[PDB]
């Protein structure tokens, strides 16, 4: 019940990222746009640009 900045309980989560030769199967939420037809546009379709 004793309170203060250094005295209150705190909840900590640590995200420890690795790197190795195995394929990296996890990725972020790559955001898409709408589809434009019949115009000159730049495009990226699943990595093909």
């Amino acid at each position: 019940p004793t309170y203060g900045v250094g005295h209150q309980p705190y909840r900590v989560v640590v995200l420890s990222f690795e790197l190795l030769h195995a394929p990296a199967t996890v990725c972020g939420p790559k955001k898409s746009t709408n589809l434009v037809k019949n115009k000159c546009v730049n495009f990226n379709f699943n990595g093909l640009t």
Binding site: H21, A22, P23, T25
Partner: protein, 39 residues
């Protein structure tokens, strides 16, 4: 990759048929040996 070819009555049908991609999984496992499983 795999293909299922109907069988007619001769078994092992003749003709050219290419296998189609089925599964592509990023495991990263070093494979040197394998074994076949029957029920």
């Amino acid at each position: 990759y795999s293909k299922h070819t109907p069988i007619i009555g001769r078994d092992f049908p003749q003709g050219f048929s290419a296998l189609e991609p089925l599964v592509d999984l990023p495991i990263g496992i070093n494979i040197t040996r394998f074994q076949t499983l029957l029920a």
